Amino acid sequence: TYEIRGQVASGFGDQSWDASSFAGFYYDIDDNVSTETLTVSDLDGNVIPEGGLVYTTTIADVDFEYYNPDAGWDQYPVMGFFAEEYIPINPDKADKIAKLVLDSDDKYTIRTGEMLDLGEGYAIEAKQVDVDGEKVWLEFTKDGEFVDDEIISVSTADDEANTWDVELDDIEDEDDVVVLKVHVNQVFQGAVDSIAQIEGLWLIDYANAMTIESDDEFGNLDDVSIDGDTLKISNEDTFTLTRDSEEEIGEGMYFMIADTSSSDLRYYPYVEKT
């Protein structure tokens, strides 16, 4: 394990950390986007009152790596969750999340009958190309099991026709959840081989999606509030910034508090990772 620290706080005033002052928080440089804050308020000496320690994360959006709004590739939602990146499976709800497997703009060729492994048990197969070489029949699988299939027409006027979005139901009680996007550039119909050329892939590990429950507790951050696109997690009871010590906030986040006299206070937050 290793440690990533934030800016140092001094004195007994209110304090605030975000991505710019705490390198542990998630941050996307291309879109210049982050989601997390940690605040300390209303200290009495070194004791934070109930509700004075607040971790907040609010959904934000970033450009697909394969950026092409006209073909249906504009932005997707992102959310920091205890210093890790997650994808909200419904872009308006902060409490249902999954890990991103792929966000890619690399070119791949799939030959009919062959599988492109996407990672974590997910794959796409070109099952067939049509005689005229303008349509490809794709199939999406998880651990060898059928999930979905679609016929994609690759040389129409409409650039969105090249994109396949897999929408699944009953994922953490959400329906119409986009779990995979695949953009097919073209099809190549050779003498012996036909191949599909892919460029643009986005996949979340929907099979491992989770829900943050109102009853969940994260160490001393044990008052979870879910308000649409924002999680706000707060302390139910007093929290002491014990001098000359480390104190868990929760779920891998900590404060380091300096060895000073009780007339002073100096501390910074940090995150522990592996």
CA distance 168 to 172: 11
Query: Residue 34: which residues within 8 A CB-CB, separation 6 or more?
Result: 18, 19, 20, 25, 26, 27, 28, 60, 80
Best CA proximity match to 48, nearest among 233, 234, 220, 238: 238
Spell out where 99-144 has E strands: 100-111, 115-119, 122-129, 135-142
Least separation, in Å, of the C-beta of 228 and ligand [N+]?
8
CA distance 57 to 98: 15
Least separation, in Å, of the C-beta of 119 and a copy of itself?
21
| Closer CB to a copy of itself, 23 or 161, in the complex | 23
CA distance 223 to 51: 9
Least separation, in Å, of the C-beta of 216 and ligand [N+]?
12
Counting contacts by CB under 8 A, is residue 27 touching a copy of itself? Answer: yes
Q: Which residues pair with 2 in a beta bridge?
A: 273
Counting contacts by CB under 8 A, is residue 17 touching a copy of itself? Answer: no
Please choose which of ligand [N+], a copy of itself, none residue 178 contacts, taking the beta carbon within 5 to 8 angstroms, the exact cut-off set by kind: none
The interface region with a copy of itself, picked from 28-36, 97-105, 188-196, 234-242 by CB under 8 A, is 28-36
The interface region with a copy of itself, picked from 21-29, 89-97, 126-134, 144-152 by CB under 8 A, is 21-29
**Interface with ligand [N+] (CB under 6 A), residue from 93, 135, 181, 183:** 93
Counting contacts by CB under 6 A, is residue 135 touching ligand [N+]? Answer: no
Site string for ligand [N+], 217-236 (x = CB under 6 A): ---------x----------
List for the chain the helix, strand, coil content (%; round to 5).
5, 60, 35
**Interface with a copy of itself (CB under 8 A), residue from 20, 208, 225, 240:** 20
Please choose which of ligand [N+], a copy of itself, none residue 95 contacts, taking the beta carbon within 5 to 8 angstroms, the exact cut-off set by kind: ligand [N+]
Counting contacts by CB under 8 A, is residue 259 touching a copy of itself? Answer: yes
Please choose which of a copy of itself, ligand [N+], none residue 181 contacts, taking the beta carbon within 5 to 8 angstroms, the exact cut-off set by kind: none
CA distance 160 to 140: 19
Three-class secondary structure of residue 159 per DSSP: helix
Task: List Cα–Cα distances, 188 to 63, 137, 140, 192, in angstroms.
Answer: 29, 13, 20, 11
For the chain, helix (H) and strand (E) counts, in that order, are: 0, 27
Counting contacts by CB under 6 A, is residue 95 touching ligand [N+]? Answer: yes
Least separation, in Å, of the C-beta of 186 and ligand [N+]?
41
CA distance 168 to 90: 12
Contact residues toward ligand [N+] (CB under 6 A) are 93, 95, 226
Contact residues toward a copy of itself (CB under 8 A) are 2, 4-8, 20-21, 23, 27, 29-30, 32, 244, 256, 258-260, 266-268, 273
